[PDB]
Amino acid sequence: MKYQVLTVGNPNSGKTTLFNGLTGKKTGSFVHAGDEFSLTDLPGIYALDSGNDSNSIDESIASRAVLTHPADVIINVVDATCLERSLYMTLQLRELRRPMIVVLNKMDALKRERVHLDLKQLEAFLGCPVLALSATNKEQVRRFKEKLHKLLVQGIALKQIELHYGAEFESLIHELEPMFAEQAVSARALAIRALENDRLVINGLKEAERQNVEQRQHECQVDIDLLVANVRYTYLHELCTHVRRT
Ligand SMILES: Nc1nc2c(ncn2[C@@H]2O[C@H](COP(=O)(O)OP(=O)(O)O)[C@@H](O)[C@H]2O)c(=O)[nH]1
Ligand SMILES: [Cl-]
Ligand SMILES: [Cl-]
């Protein structure tokens, strides 16, 4: 009866459009088929990260909320025109294993560029529901409400992405997953972030557990940021060639 919906995506992905279309950093609600929907439009971010460099306070707030804000579902709004760039965050959302839908927006611009994308198999690799849309189109957004409501009542079925970082990094992950098994979010996902040196995860930790984590970042023989960038990029690129066709 009362659902919390987070809107998350890159800047210029269409978030504010789809938020305004549904409801009538911005907050709002609507009703559909006898249930209530509290919507939140989180600021545009490109990764689930904050901290010293990621100066913008807005980005930290978005990162923090995705990490900790209550949510029945996170709507990942993805600009279908720059598909590969946007999907990097999508991967990280998937590693959180929070309930989530991908919304390919700006589909109108894509079909006038003679690009057809295999949303069926795109769904197969992300392992979460994938929806196509043009948020400026009133009819499709209303159709989107019915689709979203149905999913929330039916429950969202998720299979986790086959994302593998190589034996060493995988070992460091399974070393740190212990101290995250209680959290609302995948211990693996938080373990990966801790090796990635995410201020949000790390500062949450006990003084002891904090000095565990960076003991592992010295253990790693390759640059952690170099490894995750390559692995996610490779995965992304293979997927795009499989799903994008002309
Ligand atoms: N062609 C096309 N343009 C869109 C669509 N949705 C949004 N836009 C445009 O892309 C820009 C996105 O703005 P906005 O919704 O604020 O993106 P935000 O930065 O994520 O909040 C706006 O100028 C929109 O008019 C769409 O489905 N198709
Ligand atoms: Cl209910
Ligand atoms: Cl692309």
Author numbering: 1 to 24, 39 to 260
Task: Reproduce, without paraphrasing, sentences from the article in which this PDB structure was first reported.
For this bacterium, Feo is the primary system that transports Fe2+ into the cytosol. FeoA and FeoC are known to be small (ca. 7–10 kDa) cytosolic proteins, while FeoB is a large (ca. 80–100 kDa) polytopic transmembrane protein that contains an N-terminal soluble G-protein-like domain termed NFeoB. The status of GTP and GDP bound to the NFeoB region is hypothesized to control the opening and closing of the FeoB pore and therefore the translocation of Fe2+ into the bacterial cytosol.
Partial sequence alignments revealed that the position analogous to Asn150 within the G5 motif of the VcNFeoB NTPase domain is highly variable for NFeoBs known to be NTPases, while this same position is an invariant Thr residue for NFeoBs known to be strict GTPases. To test the structural basis of this hypothesis, we expressed, purified, and crystallized the G5 motif N150T variant of VcNFeoB(His)6 in the presence of GDP. The crystals diffracted to 2.9 Å resolution, and initial analysis revealed one apo VcNFeoB(His)6 NTPase domain and one GDP-bound VcNFeoB(His)6 NTPase domain both within the asymmetric unit. This hetero-oligomerization is likely crystallization induced based on our in-solution studies. Omit maps confirmed that substantial density was present and consistent with GDP in one, but not both, molecules within the asymmetric unit, allowing us to visualize a direct comparison between the apo and the GDP-bound N150T variant at the same resolution. Interestingly, the presence of Thr in position 150 affects the hydrogen bonding pattern surrounding the guanine nucleobase both directly and indirectly. First, the Thr hydroxyl moiety now makes a new hydrogen bond with position N1 along the purine ring. Second, the removal of Asn150 releases Asp122 to tighten and extend its hydrogen bonds with positions N1 and the H2N-C1 group. However, by comparison to the WT protein, the N150T variant appears to have two key additional hydrogen bonds surrounding the guanine purine that could affect nucleotide stability and may afford the discrimination of GTP relative to other NTPs. Our structure of N150T VcNFeoB(His)6 revealed increased H-bonding to the nucleobase due to the presence of Thr150 in the G5 motif, but this modification alone did not dramatically alter the binding affinity between NFeoB and GDP and only modestly increased the binding affinity between NFeoB and GMP-PNP.
